[PDB]
Amino acid sequence: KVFGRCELAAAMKRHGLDNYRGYSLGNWVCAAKFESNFNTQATNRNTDGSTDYGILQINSRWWCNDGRTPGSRNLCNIPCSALLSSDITASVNCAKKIVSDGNGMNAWVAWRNRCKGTDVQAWIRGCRL
Ligand SMILES: [Cl-]
């Protein structure tokens, strides 16, 4: 599924991401835009052989199992394919564990380079929430 901007904002809000660990809704929408272009089916492979999955591009090296990343962990205890569903529940629940692990949203490279320190409120402007 390819979400619309306001559609994804409303979905994330319903799943408890607004101000989660102090990060306003606009931060999450901005990260999703630049990680996956709002596409739940996005995949990208990394140099070390791990793969990133879904709307928030969660890495198989640490967070999910894809059966082809040797010596990796599965800290969200899910198959990586569950992160590609049109229902974003699994992606959101895993993201909540990632953002709580001490480094906040700096875990997402696109957020650090393209969202951090910008006016992220603009990403939810005009949406009915
Ligand atoms: Cl933080």
CSV table of N, CA and C and ligand atoms in Angstrom, one decimal:
chain,number,residue,atom,x,y,z
A,1,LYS,N,0.8,-1.2,0.0
A,1,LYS,CA,0.0,0.0,0.0
A,1,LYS,C,0.9,1.3,0.0
A,2,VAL,N,0.5,2.2,-0.8
A,2,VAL,CA,1.2,3.5,-0.8
A,2,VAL,C,0.3,4.6,-0.1
A,3,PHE,N,0.6,5.0,1.1
A,3,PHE,CA,-0.2,5.9,1.9
A,3,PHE,C,-0.2,7.3,1.3
A,4,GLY,N,-1.3,8.0,1.5
A,4,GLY,CA,-1.2,9.5,1.4
A,4,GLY,C,-0.7,10.1,2.7
A,5,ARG,N,-0.2,11.3,2.6
A,5,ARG,CA,0.4,12.0,3.7
A,5,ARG,C,-0.5,12.1,5.0
A,6,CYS,N,-1.7,12.7,4.8
A,6,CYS,CA,-2.6,12.8,5.9
A,6,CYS,C,-3.2,11.5,6.4
A,7,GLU,N,-3.4,10.6,5.4
A,7,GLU,CA,-3.8,9.2,5.7
A,7,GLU,C,-2.9,8.5,6.7
A,8,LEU,N,-1.6,8.6,6.4
A,8,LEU,CA,-0.6,8.0,7.3
A,8,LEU,C,-0.5,8.7,8.6
A,9,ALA,N,-0.5,10.0,8.7
A,9,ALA,CA,-0.6,10.8,9.9
A,9,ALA,C,-1.7,10.3,10.8
A,10,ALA,N,-2.9,10.1,10.3
A,10,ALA,CA,-4.0,9.7,11.1
A,10,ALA,C,-3.8,8.3,11.6
A,11,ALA,N,-3.3,7.4,10.7
A,11,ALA,CA,-3.0,6.0,11.2
A,11,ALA,C,-2.0,5.9,12.3
A,12,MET,N,-0.9,6.7,12.2
A,12,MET,CA,0.1,6.7,13.2
A,12,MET,C,-0.4,7.3,14.5
A,13,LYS,N,-1.2,8.3,14.4
A,13,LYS,CA,-1.8,8.9,15.6
A,13,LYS,C,-2.6,7.9,16.4
A,14,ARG,N,-3.4,7.1,15.6
A,14,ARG,CA,-4.3,6.2,16.2
A,14,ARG,C,-3.5,5.1,16.9
A,15,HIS,N,-2.3,4.8,16.4
A,15,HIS,CA,-1.5,3.7,17.0
A,15,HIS,C,-0.5,4.2,18.1
A,16,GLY,N,-0.7,5.5,18.5
A,16,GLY,CA,0.0,6.0,19.7
A,16,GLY,C,1.4,6.6,19.4
A,17,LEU,N,1.7,7.0,18.2
A,17,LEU,CA,3.0,7.6,17.9
A,17,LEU,C,3.1,9.1,18.2
A,18,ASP,N,2.0,9.8,18.3
A,18,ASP,CA,2.1,11.2,18.6
A,18,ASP,C,2.7,11.6,19.9
A,19,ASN,N,3.8,12.2,19.9
A,19,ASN,CA,4.6,12.5,21.1
A,19,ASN,C,5.2,11.3,21.8
A,20,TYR,N,5.3,10.2,21.1
A,20,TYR,CA,5.9,9.0,21.8
A,20,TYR,C,7.4,9.2,22.0
A,21,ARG,N,7.7,9.1,23.3
A,21,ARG,CA,9.1,9.4,23.7
A,21,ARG,C,9.5,10.8,23.4
A,22,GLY,N,8.5,11.7,23.3
A,22,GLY,CA,8.8,13.1,23.0
A,22,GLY,C,8.9,13.5,21.6
A,23,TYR,N,8.6,12.6,20.6
A,23,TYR,CA,8.7,12.9,19.2
A,23,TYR,C,7.3,13.2,18.6
A,24,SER,N,7.1,14.5,18.2
A,24,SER,CA,5.8,14.9,17.7
A,24,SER,C,5.5,14.1,16.4
A,25,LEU,N,4.2,14.1,16.0
A,25,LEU,CA,3.7,13.4,14.8
A,25,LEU,C,4.5,13.7,13.5
A,26,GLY,N,4.8,15.0,13.3
A,26,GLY,CA,5.5,15.4,12.1
A,26,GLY,C,6.8,14.7,11.9
A,27,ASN,N,7.5,14.4,13.0
A,27,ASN,CA,8.8,13.6,12.9
A,27,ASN,C,8.6,12.3,12.3
A,28,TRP,N,7.6,11.6,12.7
A,28,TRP,CA,7.3,10.2,12.2
A,28,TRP,C,6.9,10.2,10.7
A,29,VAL,N,6.1,11.2,10.3
A,29,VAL,CA,5.7,11.3,8.9
A,29,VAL,C,6.8,11.6,8.0
A,30,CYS,N,7.7,12.6,8.5
A,30,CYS,CA,8.9,13.0,7.7
A,30,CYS,C,9.8,11.8,7.5
A,31,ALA,N,10.0,11.0,8.6
A,31,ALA,CA,10.9,9.8,8.5
A,31,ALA,C,10.4,8.8,7.5
A,32,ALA,N,9.1,8.5,7.5
A,32,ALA,CA,8.4,7.6,6.6
A,32,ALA,C,8.5,8.1,5.1
A,33,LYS,N,8.3,9.4,4.9
A,33,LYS,CA,8.5,9.9,3.6
A,33,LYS,C,9.8,9.6,3.0
A,34,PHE,N,10.9,9.9,3.7
A,34,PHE,CA,12.2,9.8,3.1
A,34,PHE,C,12.8,8.4,3.2
A,35,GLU,N,12.3,7.6,4.1
A,35,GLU,CA,12.8,6.2,4.2
A,35,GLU,C,12.2,5.3,3.1
A,36,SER,N,10.9,5.5,2.8
A,36,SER,CA,10.1,4.5,2.0
A,36,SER,C,9.2,5.2,0.9
A,37,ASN,N,9.1,6.5,0.9
A,37,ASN,CA,8.2,7.3,0.1
A,37,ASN,C,6.7,6.8,0.4
A,38,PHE,N,6.5,6.5,1.6
A,38,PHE,CA,5.2,6.1,2.1
A,38,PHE,C,4.7,4.7,1.6
A,39,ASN,N,5.6,3.9,1.2
A,39,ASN,CA,5.3,2.6,0.5
A,39,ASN,C,5.5,1.4,1.5
A,40,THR,N,4.5,0.7,1.9
A,40,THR,CA,4.7,-0.3,2.9
A,40,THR,C,5.5,-1.5,2.3
A,41,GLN,N,5.6,-1.6,1.0
A,41,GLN,CA,6.3,-2.8,0.4
A,41,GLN,C,7.8,-2.5,0.1
A,42,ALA,N,8.3,-1.3,0.5
A,42,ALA,CA,9.7,-1.0,0.2
A,42,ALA,C,10.7,-1.9,0.8
A,43,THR,N,11.7,-2.4,0.0
A,43,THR,CA,12.9,-3.1,0.6
A,43,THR,C,14.2,-2.6,0.0
A,44,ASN,N,15.2,-2.6,0.8
A,44,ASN,CA,16.6,-2.2,0.3
A,44,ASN,C,17.7,-3.0,1.0
A,45,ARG,N,18.6,-3.5,0.2
A,45,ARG,CA,19.7,-4.3,0.8
A,45,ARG,C,20.9,-3.5,1.2
A,46,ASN,N,21.5,-3.8,2.3
A,46,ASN,CA,22.7,-3.2,2.8
A,46,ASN,C,24.0,-3.9,2.4
A,47,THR,N,25.1,-3.2,2.6
A,47,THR,CA,26.4,-3.8,2.2
A,47,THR,C,26.7,-5.0,3.0
A,48,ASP,N,26.4,-5.0,4.3
A,48,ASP,CA,26.7,-6.1,5.2
A,48,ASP,C,25.8,-7.4,4.9
A,49,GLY,N,24.9,-7.3,4.0
A,49,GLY,CA,24.0,-8.4,3.7
A,49,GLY,C,22.7,-8.4,4.4
A,50,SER,N,22.5,-7.5,5.3
A,50,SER,CA,21.2,-7.3,5.9
A,50,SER,C,20.2,-6.6,5.0
A,51,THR,N,18.9,-6.5,5.3
A,51,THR,CA,17.9,-5.9,4.5
A,51,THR,C,17.0,-5.0,5.3
A,52,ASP,N,16.6,-3.8,4.8
A,52,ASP,CA,15.7,-2.9,5.4
A,52,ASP,C,14.2,-3.1,4.9
A,53,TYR,N,13.2,-3.1,5.7
A,53,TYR,CA,11.9,-3.5,5.4
A,53,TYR,C,10.8,-2.5,5.7
A,54,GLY,N,9.9,-2.2,4.8
A,54,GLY,CA,8.7,-1.5,5.1
A,54,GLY,C,8.8,0.0,5.2
A,55,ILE,N,7.7,0.6,5.7
A,55,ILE,CA,7.5,2.0,5.7
A,55,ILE,C,8.5,2.8,6.5
A,56,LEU,N,9.1,2.1,7.5
A,56,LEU,CA,10.1,2.7,8.3
A,56,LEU,C,11.5,2.0,8.2
A,57,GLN,N,11.6,1.1,7.2
A,57,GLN,CA,12.9,0.6,6.8
A,57,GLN,C,13.7,-0.1,7.9
A,58,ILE,N,13.0,-0.9,8.7
A,58,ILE,CA,13.6,-1.6,9.8
A,58,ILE,C,14.5,-2.7,9.4
A,59,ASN,N,15.7,-2.7,10.0
A,59,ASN,CA,16.9,-3.5,9.6
A,59,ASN,C,16.9,-5.0,10.2
A,60,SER,N,17.1,-5.9,9.3
A,60,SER,CA,17.1,-7.4,9.7
A,60,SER,C,18.3,-7.8,10.5
A,61,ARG,N,19.3,-6.9,10.6
A,61,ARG,CA,20.5,-7.2,11.4
A,61,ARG,C,20.2,-7.2,12.9
A,62,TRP,N,19.2,-6.5,13.3
A,62,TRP,CA,18.8,-6.4,14.7
A,62,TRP,C,17.4,-6.7,15.1
A,63,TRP,N,16.4,-6.4,14.2
A,63,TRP,CA,15.1,-6.2,14.7
A,63,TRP,C,14.0,-7.3,14.2
A,64,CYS,N,14.3,-7.9,13.1
A,64,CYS,CA,13.4,-8.9,12.5
A,64,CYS,C,14.1,-10.1,11.9
A,65,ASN,N,13.4,-11.2,11.7
A,65,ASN,CA,14.0,-12.4,11.1
A,65,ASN,C,13.7,-12.5,9.6
A,66,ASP,N,14.6,-12.6,8.7
A,66,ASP,CA,14.3,-12.9,7.3
A,66,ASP,C,15.0,-14.2,6.8
A,67,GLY,N,15.7,-14.9,7.7
A,67,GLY,CA,16.2,-16.2,7.3
A,67,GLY,C,17.5,-16.2,6.5
A,68,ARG,N,18.0,-15.0,6.2
A,68,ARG,CA,19.2,-14.9,5.4
A,68,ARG,C,20.2,-13.8,5.9
A,69,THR,N,20.1,-13.4,7.1
A,69,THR,CA,21.1,-12.5,7.8
A,69,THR,C,21.8,-13.3,8.9
A,70,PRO,N,22.8,-14.0,8.6
A,70,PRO,CA,23.5,-14.8,9.6
A,70,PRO,C,24.0,-14.1,10.8
A,71,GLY,N,23.8,-14.7,12.0
A,71,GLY,CA,24.3,-14.1,13.2
A,71,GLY,C,23.6,-12.8,13.6
A,72,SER,N,22.4,-12.6,13.1
A,72,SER,CA,21.6,-11.4,13.4
A,72,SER,C,20.7,-11.7,14.6
A,73,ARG,N,20.1,-10.6,15.1
A,73,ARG,CA,19.2,-10.8,16.2
A,73,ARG,C,17.8,-10.5,15.7
A,74,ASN,N,16.8,-10.7,16.5
A,74,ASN,CA,15.4,-10.6,16.1
A,74,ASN,C,14.7,-9.9,17.3
A,75,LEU,N,15.0,-8.7,17.6
A,75,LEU,CA,14.6,-8.1,18.8
A,75,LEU,C,13.1,-7.7,18.9
A,76,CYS,N,12.5,-7.6,17.7
A,76,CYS,CA,11.0,-7.3,17.7
A,76,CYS,C,10.2,-8.6,17.6
A,77,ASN,N,10.9,-9.8,17.5
A,77,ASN,CA,10.4,-11.1,17.4
A,77,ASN,C,9.2,-11.3,16.4
A,78,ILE,N,9.6,-10.9,15.2
A,78,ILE,CA,8.6,-11.0,14.1
A,78,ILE,C,9.4,-11.4,12.8
A,79,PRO,N,8.7,-12.1,11.9
A,79,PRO,CA,9.3,-12.2,10.5
A,79,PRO,C,9.3,-10.9,9.8
A,80,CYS,N,10.4,-10.6,9.1
A,80,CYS,CA,10.5,-9.3,8.4
A,80,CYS,C,9.4,-9.0,7.5
A,81,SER,N,8.8,-10.1,6.9
A,81,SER,CA,7.7,-9.9,5.9
A,81,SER,C,6.5,-9.3,6.6
A,82,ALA,N,6.3,-9.5,7.9
A,82,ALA,CA,5.2,-8.9,8.6
A,82,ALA,C,5.2,-7.3,8.5
A,83,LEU,N,6.4,-6.8,8.2
A,83,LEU,CA,6.6,-5.4,8.2
A,83,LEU,C,6.2,-4.7,6.8
A,84,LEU,N,5.8,-5.6,5.9
A,84,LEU,CA,5.5,-5.1,4.6
A,84,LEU,C,3.9,-5.1,4.4
A,85,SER,N,3.2,-5.4,5.4
A,85,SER,CA,1.7,-5.4,5.3
A,85,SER,C,1.1,-4.0,5.2
A,86,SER,N,-0.1,-4.0,4.6
A,86,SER,CA,-0.8,-2.7,4.5
A,86,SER,C,-1.3,-2.2,5.8
A,87,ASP,N,-1.3,-3.1,6.8
A,87,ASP,CA,-1.7,-2.8,8.2
A,87,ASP,C,-0.4,-2.4,8.9
A,88,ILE,N,-0.2,-1.2,9.4
A,88,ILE,CA,1.1,-0.8,9.9
A,88,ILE,C,1.4,-1.1,11.3
A,89,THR,N,0.5,-1.9,12.0
A,89,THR,CA,0.6,-2.2,13.4
A,89,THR,C,2.0,-2.8,13.7
A,90,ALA,N,2.4,-3.8,13.0
A,90,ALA,CA,3.7,-4.4,13.3
A,90,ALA,C,4.9,-3.5,13.2
A,91,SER,N,4.8,-2.6,12.2
A,91,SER,CA,5.9,-1.7,12.0
A,91,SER,C,6.0,-0.7,13.1
A,92,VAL,N,4.8,-0.2,13.5
A,92,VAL,CA,4.7,0.8,14.6
A,92,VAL,C,5.2,0.2,16.0
A,93,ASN,N,4.7,-1.0,16.3
A,93,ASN,CA,5.1,-1.6,17.5
A,93,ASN,C,6.6,-1.9,17.6
A,94,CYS,N,7.2,-2.2,16.5
A,94,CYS,CA,8.7,-2.4,16.5
A,94,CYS,C,9.4,-1.1,16.6
A,95,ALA,N,8.9,-0.1,15.9
A,95,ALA,CA,9.5,1.3,15.9
A,95,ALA,C,9.5,1.8,17.3
A,96,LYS,N,8.5,1.5,18.1
A,96,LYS,CA,8.4,1.9,19.5
A,96,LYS,C,9.5,1.3,20.3
A,97,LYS,N,10.0,0.1,20.0
A,97,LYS,CA,11.1,-0.5,20.8
A,97,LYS,C,12.4,0.1,20.3
A,98,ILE,N,12.5,0.4,19.0
A,98,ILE,CA,13.7,1.0,18.5
A,98,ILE,C,14.0,2.4,19.1
A,99,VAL,N,13.0,3.2,19.1
A,99,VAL,CA,13.1,4.6,19.5
A,99,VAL,C,13.4,4.7,21.0
A,100,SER,N,13.1,3.6,21.8
A,100,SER,CA,13.3,3.6,23.2
A,100,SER,C,14.6,3.1,23.7
A,101,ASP,N,15.5,2.7,22.7
A,101,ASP,CA,16.7,1.9,23.1
A,101,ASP,C,17.9,2.8,23.5
A,102,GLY,N,17.6,4.1,23.6
A,102,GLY,CA,18.6,5.1,24.0
A,102,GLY,C,19.0,6.1,23.0
A,103,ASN,N,18.9,5.8,21.7
A,103,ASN,CA,19.4,6.7,20.7
A,103,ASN,C,18.2,7.5,19.9
A,104,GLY,N,17.0,7.3,20.4
A,104,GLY,CA,15.9,8.1,19.9
A,104,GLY,C,15.8,7.9,18.4
A,105,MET,N,15.4,8.9,17.7
A,105,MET,CA,15.1,8.7,16.2
A,105,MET,C,16.4,8.8,15.4
A,106,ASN,N,17.5,9.0,16.0
A,106,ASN,CA,18.8,9.0,15.3
A,106,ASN,C,19.1,7.6,14.7
A,107,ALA,N,18.4,6.6,15.1
A,107,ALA,CA,18.5,5.2,14.5
A,107,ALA,C,18.1,5.3,13.0
A,108,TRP,N,17.3,6.2,12.6
A,108,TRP,CA,16.9,6.4,11.2
A,108,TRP,C,17.7,7.4,10.5
A,109,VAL,N,18.6,7.0,9.6
A,109,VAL,CA,19.5,7.8,8.9
A,109,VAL,C,18.9,9.0,8.2
A,110,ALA,N,17.7,8.7,7.5
A,110,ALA,CA,17.1,9.7,6.7
A,110,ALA,C,16.5,10.8,7.7
A,111,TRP,N,16.0,10.4,8.8
A,111,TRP,CA,15.5,11.4,9.8
A,111,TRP,C,16.6,12.3,10.3
A,112,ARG,N,17.8,11.7,10.6
A,112,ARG,CA,18.9,12.5,11.1
A,112,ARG,C,19.3,13.5,10.0
A,113,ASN,N,19.4,13.1,8.7
A,113,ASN,CA,19.9,13.9,7.7
A,113,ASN,C,18.9,14.9,7.0
A,114,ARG,N,17.6,14.5,7.1
A,114,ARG,CA,16.6,15.3,6.3
A,114,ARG,C,15.4,15.8,7.1
A,115,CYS,N,15.3,15.4,8.4
A,115,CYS,CA,14.1,15.8,9.2
A,115,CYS,C,14.6,16.6,10.5
A,116,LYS,N,15.6,16.1,11.1
A,116,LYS,CA,16.1,16.7,12.4
A,116,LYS,C,16.4,18.1,12.2
A,117,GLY,N,15.9,19.0,13.1
A,117,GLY,CA,16.2,20.4,13.0
A,117,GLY,C,15.4,21.2,12.0
A,118,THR,N,14.4,20.6,11.3
A,118,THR,CA,13.6,21.3,10.3
A,118,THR,C,12.2,21.5,10.9
A,119,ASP,N,11.4,22.2,10.2
A,119,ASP,CA,10.0,22.5,10.7
A,119,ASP,C,9.2,21.2,10.3
A,120,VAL,N,9.2,20.2,11.2
A,120,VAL,CA,8.5,19.0,10.9
A,120,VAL,C,7.0,19.1,11.0
A,121,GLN,N,6.5,20.1,11.6
A,121,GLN,CA,5.1,20.3,11.8
A,121,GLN,C,4.4,20.5,10.4
A,122,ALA,N,5.2,20.9,9.4
A,122,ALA,CA,4.7,21.2,8.1
A,122,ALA,C,4.2,19.9,7.5
A,123,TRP,N,4.6,18.7,8.0
A,123,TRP,CA,4.3,17.4,7.4
A,123,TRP,C,2.9,17.0,7.8
A,124,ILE,N,2.3,17.6,8.8
A,124,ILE,CA,0.9,17.3,9.2
A,124,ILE,C,-0.1,18.5,9.0
A,125,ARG,N,0.5,19.6,8.4
A,125,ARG,CA,-0.3,20.8,8.1
A,125,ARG,C,-1.5,20.4,7.2
A,126,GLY,N,-2.7,20.9,7.5
A,126,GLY,CA,-3.9,20.6,6.7
A,126,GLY,C,-4.6,19.3,6.9
A,127,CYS,N,-4.1,18.4,7.7
A,127,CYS,CA,-4.7,17.1,7.9
A,127,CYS,C,-5.8,17.2,9.0
A,128,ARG,N,-6.8,16.4,8.8
A,128,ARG,CA,-7.8,16.3,9.8
A,128,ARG,C,-7.5,15.2,10.9
A,129,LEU,N,-7.1,15.6,12.0
A,129,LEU,CA,-6.6,14.7,13.1
A,129,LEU,C,-7.5,14.9,14.3
B,1,CL,CL,15.6,11.3,22.4
